[PDB]
Design a protein around this ligand. Structure first.
Ligand SMILES: *[C@@H]1O[C@H](CO)[C@@H](O)[C@H](O)[C@H]1NC(C)=O
Ligand SMILES: *[C@@H]1O[C@H](CO)[C@@H](O)[C@H](O)[C@H]1NC(C)=O
Ligand SMILES: *[C@@H]1O[C@H](CO)[C@@H](O)[C@H](O)[C@H]1NC(C)=O
Ligand SMILES: *[C@@H]1O[C@H](CO)[C@@H](O)[C@H](O)[C@H]1NC(C)=O
Ligand SMILES: *[C@@H]1O[C@H](CO)[C@@H](O)[C@H](O)[C@H]1NC(C)=O
Ligand SMILES: *[C@@H]1O[C@H](CO)[C@@H](O)[C@H](O)[C@H]1NC(C)=O
Ligand SMILES: *[C@@H]1O[C@H](CO)[C@@H](O)[C@H](O)[C@H]1NC(C)=O
Ligand SMILES: *[C@@H]1O[C@H](CO)[C@@H](O)[C@H](O)[C@H]1NC(C)=O
Lengths: 237, 296, 50
């Protein structure tokens, strides 16, 4: 079945750092998901569990009702010849392992790996939107869950993403694959510059792409969400 | 300016000692081409037993003064250990050339850390031959900083691709050190360790020995909060920090809120009043009495 | 703009003097402090002229 496509509507905005602000505008230069992006749509229910590229960050948005999706695997070759990463959430805890695994052809839910030879890091604990990044050997996860029942597509609205955990793993990453009615979206991040508005309490309420269309560019230049009649200078081609 | 009266420091509880027992007292070192890396955190780094202890040959390092080491809160210090020849100790520096500095191990230009090297001739000398140390000699291009390669393929010097024959114009990139006690000091094997770390970019866990003190409010004091330094009064805060935020900033890009690393309470900081001084006089010809105006 | 000119390195390693006074002794902190002084003097002169 050929892949389907859709458009995200101002989604994937997370707090760039751990510094509090209030009632101020701020410009940041970091990896984001561009507005009105061309995100790929998958249907897992006929099977669709393809290994998807992990270029420099993935915005993983999944809608669930019976908790069908389990986790993700991260690595390069996934044949125990190199180092691999594991994040599995079963009914009790979120297992995290960094070992050499002989991953199976179709790992679902427990047929995951044939064997585990060498292990480096382990950890055992006691609508969803996720963002994964790997910079300077740190694996960062931003997440926030919000219920929705409005439309069967991706609803349009603005929601911030709060930092959850940072795992000092520091491995080489190029590919990933999800661990399995169920559907999920996959979007790719890329380096852009954004403008963020903080309300009185300190929660992101709106954003503007600095380089989407000329009006948004002028808004970014003026550092204001309202622009009056006139002519303004932007840049040089 | 209202002169600050007291000084306070706030650090969390740290009791573990950094795992330097297996770093400097290591019984064996790894090959330099496949250099070792280790992550150190959640410990107090006492440098009084490094600079003021067993004589290390060199302690060249830039960016951070060695004396002030115990007074800073670092961020995810790194330890790298390997063995290089005595002539090769000079190559471990930014803006350096050489086979080791270009094909084996490179440092970034803005490197902040301390490199340590000491004599290791006695423990790494064999009369029959100490050939357990391997070094890189041939590679495609200059290694990027903080990058490791362990590929072992027959290097093609010119034309006539080797295809794994190691014939003419085909040499093995990896060669073995031969270490006798009956050699020179310049050829003597050296055990060298490299420390690299960040500074004030994230919540920190390594801070060194610094006795914590009490806290005071509504008085112009000097304060140290996880290494951050500044002058101002401490007051109760009405802001609402999220449980993932540890600092507060304003339009002026200067900190105005800070969370206590012990009581988990947020504090507001405001500057001490400075103003200006003006003198009011009717002229020295008429009288000498004057009036002083402390502005604003 | 005068306020915001206080967050520029001007060729130093940090934009805050409290991080220059620490982690460094005077002999090599002096050059970076000189760079900061030159930058801030230039900013002050420009503002005064305007
Ligand atoms: C998105 O990408 C697909 C494949 O690259 C393409 O067929 C489609 O026209 C693009 N745009 C939309 C709106 O789907
Ligand atoms: C989840 O996995 C962990 C470790 O793999 C195991 O200890 C635990 O019993 C599992 N729980 C369930 C409900 O399978
Ligand atoms: C990796 O596994 C191999 C084979 O099991 C073993 O010989 C080697 O010592 C292991 N290395 C590490 C670092 O665990
Ligand atoms: C990661 O692995 C891929 C696949 O071989 C490789 O092309 C890439 O250069 C590797 N990157 C690093 C940093 O090792
Ligand atoms: C800030 O939070 C308080 C309490 O949660 C709420 O009453 C108030 O409306 C919030 N402010 C804004 C601008 O949403
Ligand atoms: C190495 O061991 C000796 C005792 O054998 C001890 O005095 C010294 O402090 C140790 N050095 C390190 C770095 O642990
Ligand atoms: C440190 O110890 C004190 C008492 O010894 C305790 O109250 C506090 O919760 C501990 N942790 C921190 C972060 O201060
Ligand atoms: C000072 O005051 C006296 C008395 O008012 C006056 O005669 C004189 O001219 C004034 N100036 C000087 C320089 O004395």
């Amino acid at each position: 079945l050929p892949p389907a496509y859709t458009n995200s509507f101002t989604r994937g905005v997370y707090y760039p750092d751990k510094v509090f602000r209030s009632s101020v505008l701020h410009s940041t230069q970091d990896l984001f998901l561009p507005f009105f992006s061309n995100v790929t749509w998958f249907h897992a229910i006929r099977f669709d569990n393809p290994v998807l590229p992990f270029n420099d960050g993935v915005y993983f948005a999944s809608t669930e009702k019976s908790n069908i999706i389990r986790g993700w695997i991260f690595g390069t070759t996934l044949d125990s010849k190199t180092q691999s990463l594991l994040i599995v959430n079963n009914a009790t805890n979120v297992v995290i392992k960094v070992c050499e695994f002989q991953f199976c052809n179709d790992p679902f839910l427990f047929r995951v790996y044939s064997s585990a030879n060498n292990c480096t890091f382990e950890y055992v604990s006691q609508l969803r939107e996720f963002v994964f990044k790997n910079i300077d050997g740190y694996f960062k996860i931003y997440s926030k869950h919000t219920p929705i029942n409005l439309v069967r597509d991706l609803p349009q609205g603005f929601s911030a993403l709060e930092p959850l955990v940072d795992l000092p793993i520091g491995i080489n990453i190029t590919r990933f694959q999800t661990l399995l009615a169920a559907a999920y979206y996959v979007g790719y991040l890329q380096p852009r510059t954004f403008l963020l508005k903080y309300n009185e309490n300190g929660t992101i309420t709106d954003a503007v792409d600095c380089a989407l269309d000329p009006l948004s560019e002028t808004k970014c230049t003026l550092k204001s969400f309202t622009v009056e009649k006139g002519i303004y200078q932007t840049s040089n081609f | 300016r209202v002169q600050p009266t007291e000084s306070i420091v706030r650090f969390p509880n740290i009791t573990n000692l950094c795992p330097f027992g297996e770093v400097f007292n290591a019984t064996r070192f790894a090959s330099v081409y496949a250099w070792n890396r280790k992550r150190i955190s959640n410990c107090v780094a006492d440098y009084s037993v490094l600079y003021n202890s067993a004589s290390f040959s060199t302690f060249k390092c830039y960016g951070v003064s060695p004396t002030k080491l115990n007074d800073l809160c670092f961020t995810n210090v790194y330890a790298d250990s390997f063995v290089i020849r005595g002539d090769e100790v000079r190559q471990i520096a930014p803006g350096q050339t050489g086979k080791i500095a270009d094909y084996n191990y490179k440092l970034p230009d803005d490197f902040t850390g301390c490199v340590i090297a000491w004599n290791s001739n006695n423990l790494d000398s064999k009369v029959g031959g100490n050939y357990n140390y391997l070094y890189r000699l041939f590679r495609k291009s200059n290694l990027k900083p903080f990058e490791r390669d362990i590929s072992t393929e027959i290097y093609q010097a010119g034309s006539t691709p080797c295809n794994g024959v190691e014939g003419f114009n085909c040499y093995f990139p990896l060669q073995s050190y031969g270490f006798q006690p009956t050699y020179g000091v310049g050829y003597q094997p050296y055990r060298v360790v490299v420390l690299s770390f960040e500074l004030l970019h994230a919540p920190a866990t390594v801070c060194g020995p610094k006795k914590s003190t009490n806290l005071v409010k509504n008085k112009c004091v000097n304060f140290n909060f996880n290494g951050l330094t500044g002058t101002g009064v401490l007051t109760e805060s009405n802001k609402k920090f999220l449980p993932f935020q540890q600092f507060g900033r304003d339009i002026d890009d200067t900190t105005d809120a800070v969370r206590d690393p012990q009581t988990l309470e947020i504090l507001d900081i405001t500057p001490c009043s400075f103003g200006g001084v003006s003198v009011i006089t009717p002229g020295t010809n008429t009288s000498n009495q004057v009036a002083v105006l402390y502005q604003g | 703009t005068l306020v915001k000119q206080l967050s520029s390195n001007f060729g130093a390693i940090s934009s805050v003097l409290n991080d220059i006074l620490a982690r460094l002794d005077p002999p090599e902190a002096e050059v970076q402090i000189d760079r900061l002084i030159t930058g801030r003097l230039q900013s002050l002169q420009t503002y005064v002229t305007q």
